Ligand binder design. Sequence first.
Ligand SMILES: [Mg+2]
Ligand SMILES: [Mg+2]
Ligand SMILES: [Mg+2]
Ligand SMILES: [Mg+2]
Ligand SMILES: [Mg+2]
Ligand SMILES: [Mg+2]
Ligand SMILES: [Mg+2]
Ligand SMILES: [Mg+2]
Ligand SMILES: [Mg+2]
Ligand SMILES: [Mg+2]
Ligand SMILES: [Mg+2]
Ligand SMILES: [Mg+2]
Ligand SMILES: [Mg+2]
Ligand SMILES: [Mg+2]
Ligand SMILES: [Mg+2]
Ligand SMILES: [Mg+2]
Ligand SMILES: [Mg+2]
Ligand SMILES: [Mg+2]
Ligand SMILES: [Mg+2]
Ligand SMILES: [Mg+2]
Ligand SMILES: [Mg+2]
Ligand SMILES: [Mg+2]
Ligand SMILES: [Mg+2]
Ligand SMILES: [Mg+2]
Ligand SMILES: [Mg+2]
Ligand SMILES: [Mg+2]
Ligand SMILES: [Mg+2]
Ligand SMILES: [Mg+2]
Ligand SMILES: [Mg+2]
Ligand SMILES: [Mg+2]
Ligand SMILES: [Mg+2]
Ligand SMILES: [Mg+2]
Ligand SMILES: [Mg+2]
Ligand SMILES: [Mg+2]
Ligand SMILES: [Mg+2]
Ligand SMILES: [Mg+2]
Ligand SMILES: [Mg+2]
Ligand SMILES: [Mg+2]
Ligand SMILES: [Mg+2]
Ligand SMILES: [Mg+2]
Ligand SMILES: [Mg+2]
Lengths: 148, 185, 156, 127
Amino acid sequence: PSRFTKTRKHRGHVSAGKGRIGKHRKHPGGRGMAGGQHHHRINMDKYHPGYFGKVGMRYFHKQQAHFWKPVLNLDKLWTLIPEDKRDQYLKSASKETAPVIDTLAAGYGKILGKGRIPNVPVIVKARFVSKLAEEKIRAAGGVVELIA
Amino acid sequence: GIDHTSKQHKRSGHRTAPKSDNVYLKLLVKLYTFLARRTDAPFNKVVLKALFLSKINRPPVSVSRIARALKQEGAANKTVVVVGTVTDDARIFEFPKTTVAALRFTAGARAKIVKAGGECITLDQLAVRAPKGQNTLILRGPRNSREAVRHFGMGPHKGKAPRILSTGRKFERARGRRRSKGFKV
Amino acid sequence: SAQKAPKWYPSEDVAALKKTRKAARPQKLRASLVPGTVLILLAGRFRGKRVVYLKHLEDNTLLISGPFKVNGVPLRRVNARYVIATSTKVSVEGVNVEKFNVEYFAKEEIKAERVEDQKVVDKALIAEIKKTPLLKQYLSASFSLKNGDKPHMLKF
Amino acid sequence: ASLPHPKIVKKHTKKFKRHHSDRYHRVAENWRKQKGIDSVVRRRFRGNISQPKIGYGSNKKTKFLSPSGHKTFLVANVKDLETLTMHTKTYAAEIAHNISAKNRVVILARAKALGIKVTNPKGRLAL
RNA sequence: AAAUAUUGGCGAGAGACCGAUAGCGAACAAGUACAGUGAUGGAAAGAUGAAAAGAACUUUGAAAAGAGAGUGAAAAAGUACGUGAAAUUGUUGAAAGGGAAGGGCAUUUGAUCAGACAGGCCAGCAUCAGUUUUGGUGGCA
RNA sequence: GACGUAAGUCAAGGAUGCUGGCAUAAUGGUUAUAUGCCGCCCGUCUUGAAACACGGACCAAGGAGUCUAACGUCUAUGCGAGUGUUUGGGUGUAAAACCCAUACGCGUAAUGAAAGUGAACGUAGGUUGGGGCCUCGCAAGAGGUGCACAAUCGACCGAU
RNA sequence: ACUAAUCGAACCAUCUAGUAGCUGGUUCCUGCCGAAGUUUCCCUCAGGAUAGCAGAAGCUCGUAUCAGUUUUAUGAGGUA
RNA sequence: AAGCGUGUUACCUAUACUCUACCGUCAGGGUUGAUAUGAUGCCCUGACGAGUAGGCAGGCGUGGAGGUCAGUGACGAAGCCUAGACCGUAAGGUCGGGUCGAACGGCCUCUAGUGCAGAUCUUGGUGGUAGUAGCAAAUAUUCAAAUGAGAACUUUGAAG
Ligand SMILES: [Mg+2]
Ligand SMILES: [Mg+2]
Ligand SMILES: [Mg+2]
Ligand SMILES: [Mg+2]
Ligand SMILES: [Mg+2]
Ligand SMILES: [Mg+2]
Ligand SMILES: [Mg+2]
Ligand SMILES: [Mg+2]
Ligand SMILES: [Mg+2]
Ligand SMILES: [Mg+2]
Ligand SMILES: [Mg+2]
Ligand SMILES: [Mg+2]
Ligand SMILES: [Mg+2]
Ligand SMILES: [Mg+2]
Ligand SMILES: [Mg+2]
Ligand SMILES: [Mg+2]
Ligand SMILES: [Mg+2]
Ligand SMILES: [Mg+2]
Ligand SMILES: [Mg+2]
Ligand SMILES: [Mg+2]
Ligand SMILES: [Mg+2]
Ligand SMILES: [Mg+2]
Ligand SMILES: [Mg+2]
Ligand SMILES: [Mg+2]
Ligand SMILES: [Mg+2]
Ligand SMILES: [Mg+2]
Ligand SMILES: [Mg+2]
Ligand SMILES: [Mg+2]
Ligand SMILES: [Mg+2]
Ligand SMILES: [Mg+2]
Ligand SMILES: [Mg+2]
Ligand SMILES: [Mg+2]
Ligand SMILES: [Mg+2]
Ligand SMILES: [Mg+2]
Ligand SMILES: [Mg+2]
Ligand SMILES: [Mg+2]
Ligand SMILES: [Mg+2]
Ligand SMILES: [Mg+2]
Ligand SMILES: [Mg+2]
Ligand SMILES: [Mg+2]
Ligand SMILES: [Mg+2]
């Protein structure tokens, strides 16, 4: 709101906080990104290195839906089970009845291996897995099922 | 005239009160002001100062962080004190039965502590049962893990994050960031 | 409401005064102020009259009567700071003076007993004055500062 | 009367009139602080007007006290007046300017019966 | 076809908008009066009173008008009309004024004005405390 | 603290006692004037303004850091590994209030130009400090544990 | 030269509130703190960015890693 | 010497130094078994106070909005005038008298087209100049009568 602004406190003072010498002007250094290579060069190299120039190969007509692959770590793998159902699987870490986790229905593309799942066998249906995420799922007795 | 050695009329630079207008936090400050003054326990003075802190100065404390601190030798039965919010953490699967005193609990954090057999209490209940902070263990969350801390201290060779909106190729991965394009950092 | 209210109110308690340590001790007079001394009154109705000092009363005033038959100044009080103690003295160890105090001069025609007390003290005082010559004329004449009088150098 | 109070020292009894408020009609007597670069009044040259400053602040024991020792409370009716029933030695009622003549009669008779001082017991009277 | 657009037109309902130098240029005979060869440019201007009850009648004046009288709650509302500021002006009163005037501190004089008797005002002396100043005298190295 | 045997007294953590006059313009306030001394015209640019620099004859009214999109820091608030009801739908006392599904945005993963790959040797490490807590201590201290944070050597992930 | 008091490119309206590193102005009070005209770079020299000076928000702690100062010890310098 | 050189005292007075009071700021503290209900309150202690550009903080005032004071008012609201009074360091607030005639305030919050001495600022109004500069080119007017309140200027006659 206007009543809390310094404009109200600058009433009565001549320059409104802009100085008598500097004498607040229209666009003293140019407009926008002007002089990024000439008179604003130091600010660019200090705070935005990499701004000028080109980087690698172009991609005509990029569809981000091609590259959709949300990653899920192993420490969050057991969150795909509802919590009331989750405890009776943590107890009785048994094969012949193992939770089937469809990571795709929860919206994940690749299972990654941040690790330390419990020692309960788990059936993981994943589009992709990392090598280490596969090692820790098999070490717990489970298996990774490849889907599409 | 006086040859002044230090700046005159200088405020201490520390909060003497919370900026918050929460009436119940003011009652907690009112209770722990009395305890810090009428007791010699350094615990009460630390808690009173922590009640003044801003939101970024009291990051959330995970229950996993609480559980790791209870794995310390001789700390398995202490009252964990968090002047701030205790959040849940699903990455841990074995929580111990302990008592946590905190300013705020999330719904998941309250459920996890109670389910493990423990108890969630407020800071006024902590004061009644531990007036001098006996057998307490103050826990603080990670303060430099904020996303704004990444960009603090930007400059050449500093290895800090640039203040950027859109990331990827074509956004500050060129001249100034690699030897093939002018110079690097 | 034209004015809202004081949010809380100041107490109308009349706090008692702290215990002051100011004991009242008797006045020390100038050495030149001794009974029998002739004094010059510096102000009041009897400005510049020469009077005879008799007693130091308990209100710290000076009891004087430069004899009423001599110069007309009756028995009355004067402030010590408003008189000049001269070097002339009359022997007063024959004058009944103990009867006069602060209560004698309480304000509230002349009272009949006051003129009788005057007619007793003056007889025992005028008799001593007639011994040393010219004091009756001295006490009937008024003091005055004249052209060339420097009180800082005059030895009264 | 009122409560006993120390002797009230005003510390500056003169109004702080604005510089050049007598020179030009367009400049009001309401105090404004000179902010000119060359201003002799701002620069505090000898012989110029004194600017208000915190050194002139009144003693807190006698601040807001009227010469009779009371603080002034503006009242508009009987209910406003009866607020000061137990505070007659620290507060004197002053009847608001827009109170009608008949209502001033009622307020004064109520304040007289309660022993409340009235700052202006002469506005809108048949005298 | 519908879901979409809509500073034009027609009919509506509203507003934490503006309140006659504002709000449309225009609250009013406003795109008017007026200016320009022309294209175009483009104002100012609201308020008596509840009701004209808008002052009959007398008197002075050539008349305007004035003085009364009257109407009205009010004429300190008289169509030169609600209120009626300032700049500027007249009259009256007060004050001061040797080539400016105005101002700050303090007091004299003149004017004017507030409160208090169940302590208010101004003082004098004594005995002390704090800070000082100016003398007199004593005992030692 | 001092004196006094004590009671108590005192000049010892800040004035009391006695007395008079007036009780009103007497003191005081305000204002005009007089006198002593002082006082150059403001604003502005400027190293420097009373300037023989510039604007200002006077008065009234109007008159100049606003709103928006996106964003940095900080703070407050809600919830919290999630968060964001208001594009919409339902409903309504109807531009309000109240309720809600699926998505989507950001976050929870990075790195590489890219193809791709993708975060625990260990009590999520070792060392030096570190508030607080615990134990022994009359205490000073000593020992244990040490969150945040600071330094350093490692380990893991991506690139080379 | 003249082209309607307009001519080294008329007048009218709109784009248009054209841009201006340049001039002027930028409206209440009090309290606390309180500068710079210097570094580097720029078609830079009446400008800006950058570092410095300044304010504010504080945070971690609680008498210290300290200091526009001296002493002691040990270096260095090539001006009077 | 009231000049020059030198020496000795006394004296004068800065917003400087010392002491005290009061204001504010900062810092360090005290204060809950009725603090004998204000805990951003009350109180104790110490230090400090210049300031352009500039930063921050606490407040004053204006238009409109939610709430409240069952607030004020035709027995006078608002406005305006008032060398009349009071409060605040101040921004300002409050009252008395006059004038007037219909609406307007206090407090807790919300909101802004929110505060003017300047911009050769905009619009309107008014001054000093000032009863002043001037109303002097084109040869030139005069007399009587009439009319009229009033005739240098109208009408007629006569003349030039
Ligand atoms: Mg300033
Ligand atoms: Mg100005
Ligand atoms: Mg300027
Ligand atoms: Mg270049
Ligand atoms: Mg005042
Ligand atoms: Mg200057
Ligand atoms: Mg208009
Ligand atoms: Mg024409
Ligand atoms: Mg009008
Ligand atoms: Mg009227
Ligand atoms: Mg009138
Ligand atoms: Mg009228
Ligand atoms: Mg009128
Ligand atoms: Mg006038
Ligand atoms: Mg003078
Ligand atoms: Mg006077
Ligand atoms: Mg002078
Ligand atoms: Mg310039
Ligand atoms: Mg120059
Ligand atoms: Mg100047
Ligand atoms: Mg110029
Ligand atoms: Mg000019
Ligand atoms: Mg002008
Ligand atoms: Mg204005
Ligand atoms: Mg809603
Ligand atoms: Mg995005
Ligand atoms: Mg052309
Ligand atoms: Mg513009
Ligand atoms: Mg233009
Ligand atoms: Mg300073
Ligand atoms: Mg600084
Ligand atoms: Mg050399
Ligand atoms: Mg001389
Ligand atoms: Mg200052
Ligand atoms: Mg408005
Ligand atoms: Mg009125
Ligand atoms: Mg009306
Ligand atoms: Mg404006
Ligand atoms: Mg103006
Ligand atoms: Mg003339
Ligand atoms: Mg002619």
